[PDB]
Amino acid sequence: TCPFYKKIPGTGFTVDAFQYGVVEGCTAYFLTHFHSDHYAGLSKHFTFPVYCSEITGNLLKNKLHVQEQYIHPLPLDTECIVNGVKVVLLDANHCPGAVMILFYLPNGTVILHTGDFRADPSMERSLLADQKVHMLYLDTTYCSPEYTFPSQQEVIRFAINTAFEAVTLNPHALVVCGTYSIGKEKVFLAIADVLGSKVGMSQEKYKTLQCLNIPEINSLITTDMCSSLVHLLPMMQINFKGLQSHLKKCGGKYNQILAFRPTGWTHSNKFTRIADVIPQTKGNISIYGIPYSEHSSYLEMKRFVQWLKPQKIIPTVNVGTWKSRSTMEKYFREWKLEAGY
Ligand code: NI
């Protein structure tokens, strides 16, 4: 049964609610982004209208085989009417195709559902600037002040400088990057660009990337592993055993691996600067954990909310424990008292 924080009152709508069977009263199912915790339940046998971005609709059709007649892609930054209700999709600064949804209820209430997002000051100049929001359904993944991490631009600068140094010192080093979902593509694309290489990967990952409308993608990626010195592997294989095994397969072309695991936050963030990050090393293999986040830090989240000034906040993450819920409610009240709304 569908939980309340996935229902939009005063509508026939749900958000990211595909794992509950047929939801009573639902006339349109919205999908914010193509991550498995949110799409859980969708398949070629789904027969209700799914509303989403163009990129999400490419992935639904090609990866999950949802039939075309049920996919309803909407342009961004554009007022659209769905089952008699005005909606707008906004870029969420999460993974490719990820959106926030603005719903203009028939009674005058305005609701923003962030989906998953990484808040940014640029959002203060979208279509959000133009009217008041009563209710905010908020991605609270890192809603606590201990969650700090650098900008994506600092993290990419570290990755590129690290990879370029290693491979210039040793032209026989291979670079490997972990992945297990869409998102974080800048990591492996920026490294391959500094090295003058395409990114090599499995046919299944190449297929996924070909759905993302990335400019000039045919120039950046390939399934010919032998032509590439940046390889993508499943996240589960980014360990000393799995990387040793991969190095065997390359037919003595390489004699060293430099590997990256983009994580979200880890507790080595509470002590160490990005500049000071070091790898774990075993023989000719080194593994870097880099804190590349596609979710808001605490301070980015707090800035967004204090700017938006919502009347009510509904968290969508960390909702399963009383201790989490009570922590989050305390920060919401602080923010409201400090800013005066
Ligand atoms: Ni996500």
- DSSP, residue by residue, 136-188: EEE--TT-STT-----HHHHHHHHHHHHHHHHHH-TTEEEEEEESSS--HHHH
* Ion ligand 1 residue ranges (Cβ < 5 Å): 35, 116
Compute the distance from residue 183 Cα to the ligand 1 centre, in Å.
8
Of 257, 236, 184, 254, the residue nearest 214 (C-alpha):
184
Compute the distance from residue 94 Cα to the ligand 1 centre, in Å.
7
Compute the distance from residue 139 Cα to the ligand 1 centre, in Å.
9
| CB proximity list for 118: less than 8 A, separation 6 or greater | 92, 93, 94, 293, 294, 295, 296, 300
HEC profile of 104-144: ECCCCCEEEECCCCCCCHHHHHCHHHHCCCCEEEECCCCCC
Compute the distance from residue 278 Cα to the ligand 1 centre, in Å.
27
Compute the distance from residue 173 Cα to the ligand 1 centre, in Å.
33
| CB proximity list for 272: less than 8 A, separation 6 or greater | none
Compute the distance from residue 72 Cα to the ligand 1 centre, in Å.
20
Distance in angstroms (rounded) separating the CA atoms of residues 101 and 88: 6
Distance in angstroms (rounded) separating the CA atoms of residues 113 and 102: 7
CATH fourth-level superfamily of 1-147+296-341:
Ribonuclease Z/Hydroxyacylglutathione hydrolase-like (3.60.15.10)
Looking at the DSSP bridge assignments, the partners of residue 221 are 199
Q: Report helix, strand or coil for 29.
A: strand
Question: Tokens in use for 297?
Answer: 């830090």
Give span(s): CATH 3.40.50.12650, the chain: 148-295
Compute the distance from residue 107 Cα to the ligand 1 centre, in Å.
31
Distance in angstroms (rounded) separating the CA atoms of residues 218 and 66: 25
Q: Tokens 């990626």: give the residue.
A: 221
Give span(s): CATH 3.60.15.10, the chain: 1-147+296-341
Compute the distance from residue 200 Cα to the ligand 1 centre, in Å.
24
Chain discontinuities in the chain, listed by preceding residue (C to N exceeding 2.5 Å): none
Distance in angstroms (rounded) separating the CA atoms of residues 298 and 58: 32
Compute the distance from residue 251 Cα to the ligand 1 centre, in Å.
37
Distance in angstroms (rounded) separating the CA atoms of residues 181 and 211: 13
Distance in angstroms (rounded) separating the CA atoms of residues 114 and 140: 10
Compute the distance from residue 141 Cα to the ligand 1 centre, in Å.
10
* 164-169: long-range pairs with CB below 8 Å, 24+: 164/194, 164/195, 166/256, 166/258, 167/195, 167/229, 167/258
Compute the distance from residue 295 Cα to the ligand 1 centre, in Å.
8
Distance in angstroms (rounded) separating the CA atoms of residues 332 and 168: 49
Q: Report helix, strand or coil for 308.
A: helix
Fold annotation for 148-295:
Rossmann fold (3.40.50)
Local structure of residue 325 (DSSP, 8 states): H
Q: Report helix, strand or coil for 28.
A: strand
Compute the distance from residue 115 Cα to the ligand 1 centre, in Å.
8
Compute the distance from residue 256 Cα to the ligand 1 centre, in Å.
33
Identify the experimental approach. X-ray
